[PDB]
Structure 1
């Protein structure tokens, strides 16, 4: 089983290639990591296994979900420390994902009920909803387009949060630059309608992610920085006219940062679109995943370093990915929510527990969080 051949990610000697994908769960009450998070990550930690935390706030305006943890205050750093320690005690490697949602927020999540910030004044359309604190779905509002100086301030928020993650003991950080969030709002030409140096050309649209990555790299070292993007996922109206061209443009910027820094990043993590095959239709089962696979393979081939694939992977698809050289590591989200011992279940080819979407974002410290059972 290729998922169990060891992999050397920088200094880290991973014992297997099954990675815990970053997943927002909303148990960090009032943005403070809670003991429940410690139990949750400890359940999933394995010796030589790599874990990525849920998206974590880099500032007071960075959230668009309730009770997501932050790492911009010392109080938050002290609580993260306890989680990092328990995970390290199991022999796992863990990175903290730094997340700013940009326009994907609501006044209820902003200080003084201010408008969310973004590259643009254009709001996410009503084709999408936001989870409100009371559990209902809300409408995304119009964001405020930020200027060059404020952009440098947000970059500084990433730098300060990366330093704090290192202070908490994390092995590194992952820049959430995917799924239509703040960085993707600058990358995607379907969102970025700016006329200044951060808009228009591919170079201009890639300026923001480059500045963010360079700032964290210069603060903690490229080896402790992973980058996540999703050029072909249009979640929250984040489409680009040419996904592959955009993805390759980002990859070249990362390749350039590495050469200039004289060091490689921890990895490039890419989420791919995954089309569920509907069995109730005439030709749903006759589809092909070919094209989306070629896009992923091209980004991996273009990138000089470790590649982590994600998005609807199963045991069989993960084995295939590593076996064909399409990826070095494979991250799993939903199956890891319901299978604390996912790594062991994939090693033994055991049945996998079903997951309950209803409790993905609820606040209970146990229910739908740490009560999914281990192999008996």
Structure 2
């Protein structure tokens, strides 16, 4: 089983290639990492396995879900350290995903009820709804388009949050540049209607993700930085006229960051739409992997069978699993043994109970 051949991710000697994908679960009450997160990540930690945390706030204005953890306060750093310590005691590697939602927010999640920020003033359309703190769904509002100075301020929020993650003991961070959130709002030409140096050409639309990655690389070292993108996923009205071209343009920038800095990133992590994985039971994921000089993590609809094939065929070095890892704490062992998998319950994906639907999925 090629998922269980060892893989060297930079300095980390991973014992297998099954990765916990980052997933928002909304158990970090009032944005403080809770003891429940410690139990949840400990359940899923394995010796030599790689874990990526749920998306984590980089600033008071970066959230678009309730009770998502932050890492922009020293208090949050203190609580994360206890979670990281428990995961490390099980021999796992863990990166903190740094997440700014951009226009995918709501007055209820913003300080003083202010407008969410974005590359544009266009809102997400009404065919997407936002989860509210009381469990209902609301309307995405009009965002405020930020200028170049404020862009540099958001870049500094990523930098400070990366330093805080290292202070908490994380082995690295992952830049969330996918799924229609703030970075993707600069990448995707269906969203980026700017006419300044951050809009228009592929080079200009890639400016923001390049500045973010460069800032964190210069703060904590390239080896501790992973980057996640999703050029073909249209979540939250985030469409590009040429996803392959946009994806290659991003890979181009990452390769050059690595050349200039003198060190490779931890990895590039790409999610594909779930319908692509269903058809495999496309060439986009392989094309990005072939173009990127370093470690490649594939994600999006993967199964045990599709994961094995991805690694065997050379389509990826690592395979991250989301929904199956929610309901299977010991997903790694179930995949090793080809054991049955627990069904996952979508109703408790984003609820606040520290146990129900979170840590009470049973082991084999």
Give the TM-score normalised by the residue count of structure 2: 0.99
1:280 deviation in Å?
19
- 1:307-318 mapped onto 2 (5 Å cutoff): 307-318=296-307
Question: C-alpha distance in 2, partners of 1:45/1:334?
Answer: 16
Residues 149-197 of structure 1 deviation map (CA, whole Å, 9 limit, x = unaligned):
0000000000000000000000000000000000000000000000000
1:362 deviation in Å?
0.1
Residues 94-141 of structure 1 deviation map (CA, whole Å, 9 limit, x = unaligned):
000000000000000000000000000000001101000000011100
Question: C-alpha distance in 1, partners of 2:156/2:286?
Answer: 33
1:273 deviation in Å?
1.0
Taking a change above 3 Å as real, the CA distance of residues 280 and 43 of structure 1, as seen in their structure-2 partners, is: closer
Q: The residue matched to 1:104 in structure 2 has which SS?
A: coil
Question: C-alpha distance in 1, partners of 2:313/2:273?
Answer: 19
1:277 deviation in Å?
9.4
Q: The residue matched to 2:40 in structure 1 has which SS?
A: helix
1:55 deviation in Å?
0.1
Question: C-alpha distance in 2, partners of 1:127/1:309?
Answer: 28
Residues 301-344 of structure 1 deviation map (CA, whole Å, 9 limit, x = unaligned):
00000000000000000000000000000000000000000000
Give the aligned CA root-mean-square deviation in angstroms.
1.7
* Residue aligning to 1:360: 349
Give the TM-score normalised by the residue count of structure 1: 0.96
Question: C-alpha distance in 1, partners of 2:18/2:336?
Answer: 10
Q: The residue matched to 1:67 in structure 2 has which SS?
A: coil
Taking a change above 3 Å as real, the CA distance of residues 276 and 324 of structure 1, as seen in their structure-2 partners, is: closer
Q: The residue matched to 2:96 in structure 1 has which SS?
A: strand
1:279 deviation in Å?
13
Question: C-alpha distance in 2, partners of 1:69/1:301?
Answer: 34
Question: C-alpha distance in 1, partners of 2:316/2:125?
Answer: 34
Question: C-alpha distance in 1, partners of 2:86/2:176?
Answer: 24
Question: C-alpha distance in 2, partners of 1:94/1:340?
Answer: 16
- 1:105-116 mapped onto 2 (5 Å cutoff): 105-116=105-116
Conservation of the 8 A alpha-carbon contact between 2:179 and 2:235: yes
Task: Verify: 1:350 aligned to 2:342, yes or no.
Answer: no
1:276 deviation in Å?
7.9
Unaligned runs of 5+ residues in structure 1 are 282-292
Deviation >4 Å, runs of 4+: 276-281
Conservation of the 8 A alpha-carbon contact between 2:229 and 2:271: yes
Question: C-alpha distance in 2, partners of 1:359/1:332?
Answer: 18
Taking a change above 3 Å as real, the CA distance of residues 279 and 251 of structure 1, as seen in their structure-2 partners, is: closer
Question: C-alpha distance in 1, partners of 2:115/2:137?
Answer: 18
1:275 deviation in Å?
1.2
Question: C-alpha distance in 2, partners of 1:248/1:3?
Answer: 26
Question: C-alpha distance in 2, partners of 1:150/1:102?
Answer: 13
Conservation of the 8 A alpha-carbon contact between 2:126 and 2:140: yes
Aligned residues: 364
- 1:278-297 mapped onto 2 (5 Å cutoff): 293-297=282-286
Q: The residue matched to 2:48 in structure 1 has which SS?
A: coil
Q: The residue matched to 2:356 in structure 1 has which SS?
A: coil
Question: C-alpha distance in 1, partners of 2:324/2:317?
Answer: 19
Residues 63-91 of structure 1 deviation map (CA, whole Å, 9 limit, x = unaligned):
00000000000000000000000000000
Conservation of the 8 A alpha-carbon contact between 2:277 and 2:301: no
Taking a change above 3 Å as real, the CA distance of residues 206 and 60 of structure 1, as seen in their structure-2 partners, is: same
Taking a change above 3 Å as real, the CA distance of residues 275 and 78 of structure 1, as seen in their structure-2 partners, is: same
Taking a change above 3 Å as real, the CA distance of residues 277 and 267 of structure 1, as seen in their structure-2 partners, is: closer
Residues 244-264 of structure 1 deviation map (CA, whole Å, 9 limit, x = unaligned):
000000000000000000000
Question: C-alpha distance in 2, partners of 1:343/1:245?
Answer: 34
Residues 230-286 of structure 1 deviation map (CA, whole Å, 9 limit, x = unaligned):
0000000000000000000000000000000000000000000121899999xxxxx
Moved more, 343-352 or 272-281: 272-281
- 1:170-181 mapped onto 2 (5 Å cutoff): 170-181=170-181
Taking a change above 3 Å as real, the CA distance of residues 278 and 312 of structure 1, as seen in their structure-2 partners, is: closer
